[PDB]
Design a binder for this molecule. Sequence first.
Ligand code: HEC
Ligand code: HEC
Ligand code: HEC
Ligand code: HEC
Ligand code: HEC
Ligand code: HEC
Ligand code: HEC
Ligand code: HEC
Ligand code: HEC
Ligand code: HEC
Ligand code: HEC
Ligand SMILES: [Ca+2]
Ligand SMILES: [Fe+3]
Ligand SMILES: [Mg+2]
Ligand SMILES: [Mg+2]
Length: 800
Amino acid sequence: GLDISQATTLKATLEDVKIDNGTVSVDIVLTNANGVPVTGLEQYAQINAIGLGIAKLTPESGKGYKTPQWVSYINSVKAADPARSLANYSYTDGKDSAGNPITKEVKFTPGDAIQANIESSCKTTCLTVVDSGVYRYTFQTNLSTLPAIEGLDLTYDPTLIHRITLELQTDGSKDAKLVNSHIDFLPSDNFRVAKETETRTVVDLEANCIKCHSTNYSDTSSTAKPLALHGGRRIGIANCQVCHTSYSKDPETGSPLDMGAMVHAIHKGTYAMVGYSGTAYDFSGTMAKAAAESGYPQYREGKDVSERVTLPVSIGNCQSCHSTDDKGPVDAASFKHHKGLACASCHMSGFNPVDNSEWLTPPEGQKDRGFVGNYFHYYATPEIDGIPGVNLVHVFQNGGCASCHAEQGEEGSAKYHLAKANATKLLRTEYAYKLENGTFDVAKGELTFTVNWHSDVAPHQDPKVKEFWVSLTAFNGTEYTMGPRPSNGTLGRSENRISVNLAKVETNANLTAVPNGSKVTYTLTGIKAVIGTSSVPYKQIVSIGKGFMDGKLLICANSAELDPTMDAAIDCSNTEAPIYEVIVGSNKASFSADASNVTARSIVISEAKCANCHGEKADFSASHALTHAADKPDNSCGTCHSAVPNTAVALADGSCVACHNGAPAHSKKPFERGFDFKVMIHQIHADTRSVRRLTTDAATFPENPANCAACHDKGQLSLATLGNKPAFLASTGEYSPTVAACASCHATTATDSAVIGHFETNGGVYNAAAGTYTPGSETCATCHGEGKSFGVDKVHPVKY
Ligand code: HEC
Ligand code: HEC
Ligand code: HEC
Ligand code: HEC
Ligand code: HEC
Ligand code: HEC
Ligand code: HEC
Ligand code: HEC
Ligand code: HEC
Ligand code: HEC
Ligand code: HEC
Ligand SMILES: [Ca+2]
Ligand SMILES: [Fe+3]
Ligand SMILES: [Mg+2]
Ligand SMILES: [Mg+2]
């Protein structure tokens, strides 16, 4: 009491107990959710797995500090399956400068390989009940009778910190009756629990991975996507680390299984390897491309997986995964120290000591540092590096050793990796500004507003300010509407938006700036529109007379400034240094007839949640690269199309919805790739968008898209006023607001006419003629609003 077969939850800790003579054993305390010990395991006919592993944490040395690494005592040499040993291939991608197609090559090194593993085949056979719920595992594996493996030192050493892991699973259970636990200890100190500061953690699931990954292991829905590997049984980092060691490899490809090398390459979209049952897992998507383009008979659609990982931050954004704020692992700084496979996993993509065998020999009369060392020291170039434009050899020759080789508490290559992110923070603080409310004299066509700038050197006088965009958008109090595309006007070519570069006051005849210390008052004139049936520029700005103003300031920063006590900002016309751009947003101010506030548009998503995956203050100019991207936002087509820059900053306050709303202007897309913000964002992240503008690859969303709480906070989906918004008029017809929201996943076309009829029965319109919907007519909220009978929070797999 209580019997395993009536237990609904298991919790286990193998925190307990220890070994001698090479013979290892450990106690497993198996209990309830509440903590009633579960009895009868050792007899149980419904056990799926019981696995235990053990490993020592060996030290490493070289120039500077290098972190310790796990060695499993349990290992074996695996041979490659001949028919699943992947062949080399190539594929076309893009054109060179002459306009000729570029061919890329992907290369492998199939061959026998070491793999760390655990003890899985024993199960109950190794168990002796010792107490209520408390079992005892003695390893079949003895530390003394371990078969030698070439290159690997497997000798037992009680002075080194040690790990044992448990994976335990019953009744086919993906969560409730699944456990991974582990114990680290120091055998020599009578097997005492290791201090956090003694073992090796490096990354923590919650501090480092959860910002993007789902850990809803029990998720039953069709779109579940929890981070649980190997049939669903492996979920804890501490467990990964025993098998995914620096020496393990996939024999079919030569790919490393080292945890860092594997994790960097997966998220960079370069990793490929063959796993259980000969399934090829290609994280680049290029295998499927090659198969399509020239044949590749080892790729089997519907069994092998070849899809490009689409990471929502830069692979250079280390803080996404490695803590720098001292609230993660105590050994978090491990990422600052050189380690061949880690460094190579980004900078040496696609190279190997067989196809790049020259790099095994240093240049004449230089020291041999191994394959990776020699690349970093001698052979790397900007044209070939895994991060294009990077020059490692120049840092070797010119930047001093402490650039990569770090003593404990030094920065090492982190000085290069975090430099732009750090300077970005400082410059956003230093150039912070406030927009005051504007006074719009509509009959005069004149908007006056004041910027509270950081100093008495105004934006147009500061050569480190590349551009300083302020955009104003009409807002009628219900929802933004872009409207039809007008003919061009002096200030822009949109009915509802004007963007003006305040840094170019001296050459803009419509713009005046009057400084008063730090405060600069700007007067923009020529905002005039004849109101009738025709589309004309500023038509809504003029007829509504009010709305919002948003700032997007671009500061030029010096990419060669690495010392954080120096000034990062640099004169934009400087020619020595490569320059990168720092973005500084603002408050969202109002404009109106007397400069009083305009009530804020409702907030229906969480800024912080977008930032979990995209990082803080992500920029989306590059999302506007397809069409008229080089047109400036004060100039004709660029008013809407610009990427230089796109003039929105924040994600949750409706800045994007100023354009991405239910009334796209011209060359309209159909619903199934529609322009309206909720429709677009739902379709991208749920892979229901028929076509993405800039890539043929579907987003690889690391959460469950039906987990509404990935983006929405509790209380944001009441749906109470949603039916009062304007319908979304797509190319072919219009869709009422709640319909557009739900059908973006549920019905991107009229495939299932029961769903469509459900919409039409309850006040909804779906691909109807323009003007059919009357705001107010949808009655969706009564049943689907949060907390109702079929509430969006009850019916989807949410985790708030
Ligand atoms: C206003 C036009 C709407 C819209 C846009 C939706 N609903 Fe409903 N809905 C209700 C019930 C009882 C179900 C079935 C529940 C179940 O089988 O578990 C549904 C189903 C849906 C869906 C899912 C359709 C699909 O199979 O993909 C969608 C997208 C949807 N609804 C949207 C209940 C109600 C109501 C109770 C009287 C009301 C009113 C509405 N729904 C209104 C709307
Ligand atoms: C030892 C029992 C393992 C533990 C614990 C974990 N993994 Fe693993 N994994 C292991 C091996 C030997 C292999 C290669 C198999 C081969 O055929 O050569 C892998 C493979 C992966 C992969 C590649 C994709 C796949 O084959 O499914 C991934 C992404 C992976 N492993 C991840 C991973 C994670 C995150 C783990 C902790 C939750 C983890 N594995 C534990 C062996 C073992
Ligand atoms: C998740 C998508 C990551 C990003 C982005 C970066 N790193 Fe990483 N890194 C990650 C993991 C899961 C690990 C393995 C930890 C382990 O159990 O081995 C690492 C490891 C490294 C290491 C090696 C650390 C060590 O073995 O002690 C280094 C040197 C490293 N990472 C550097 C690094 C840099 C510079 C990054 C930004 C440019 C970066 N990593 C990103 C996960 C992820
Ligand atoms: C990054 C651009 C580096 C700079 C600058 C320097 N070194 Fe380096 N070195 C680097 C790597 C990635 C490696 C491989 C490490 C591995 O685990 O494979 C090496 C190797 C060495 C070694 C061997 C011992 C070791 O620390 O692993 C030595 C002794 C060494 N490098 C010396 C060295 C010196 C003297 C440098 C300044 C003139 C120097 N390195 C710069 C990366 C980089
Ligand atoms: C991807 C997760 C990486 C890992 C692993 C490593 N580095 Fe890296 N490196 C990466 C990026 C995205 C960049 C460019 C940074 C930028 O702001 O543009 C770099 C750059 C470097 C540099 C500077 C190169 C130059 O300025 O020309 C060095 C010296 C460097 N990287 C070294 C290095 C070492 C030694 C690593 C192992 C600890 C290592 N990198 C891992 C991305 C990634
Ligand atoms: C992780 C669970 C995410 C959450 C939370 C948010 N986004 Fe996302 N998004 C994610 C991925 C993996 C991708 C694909 C990235 C790629 O390179 O293709 C995206 C994509 C976007 C895009 C499109 C970018 C492009 O095609 O140019 C947009 C505009 C976007 N995401 C916006 C966005 C918003 C506003 C979110 C909060 C409501 C948000 N995302 C959350 C991963 C995740
Ligand atoms: C008008 C001034 C815009 C604002 C403000 C925002 N976007 Fe936009 N976007 C706009 C247009 C005219 C286009 C068409 C394509 C082009 O290159 O001009 C787009 C397109 C997008 C897309 C394309 C997605 C796809 O079809 O797969 C994305 C992902 C996108 N825009 C994102 C986006 C975000 C997140 C914005 C707020 C930061 C945003 N846009 C503002 C016009 C305008
Ligand atoms: C805002 C008032 C716009 C201005 C000014 C111009 N365009 Fe545009 N365009 C706009 C939208 C919202 C869209 C997407 C419609 C959708 O439903 O997704 C477009 C589309 C195009 C296209 C099609 C390619 C595409 O990215 O979808 C083209 C070729 C195009 N726009 C050209 C174009 C030109 C030449 C303009 C100046 C004469 C111009 N656009 C202005 C919105 C707006
Ligand atoms: C977004 C910025 C991420 C963070 C932070 C981390 N991961 Fe990730 N991971 C991300 C994406 C977009 C993908 C592809 C889509 C998907 O979820 O399948 C992944 C994938 C993985 C995998 C492979 C899963 C599989 O198919 O076998 C692994 C093993 C993985 N990610 C691990 C992982 C770890 C350990 C992280 C913290 C150190 C982590 N990721 C952070 C996006 C993001
Ligand atoms: C991030 C990738 C999202 C996930 C996951 C889900 N939604 Fe969403 N939603 C997203 C955005 C960018 C928007 C528009 C935001 C804005 O400022 O306009 C929306 C909007 C909605 C709406 C309209 C709500 C309203 O305006 O009153 C609804 C009804 C909605 N989303 C529903 C919803 C459901 C039920 C989800 C889980 C199945 C869900 N969303 C996921 C972004 C994201
Ligand atoms: C993508 C992010 C979605 C949004 C937006 C909406 N829904 Fe959804 N919904 C989505 C998925 C992938 C699923 C399947 C979940 C599962 O457990 O397999 C669902 C489920 C439902 C259901 C269940 C009943 C049914 O007949 O399917 C209902 C009733 C439902 N969803 C309603 C609904 C409404 C009203 C939405 C707009 C407010 C809506 N969903 C948005 C994915 C997404
Ligand atoms: Ca394999
Ligand atoms: Fe035309
Ligand atoms: Mg002027
Ligand atoms: Mg564009």
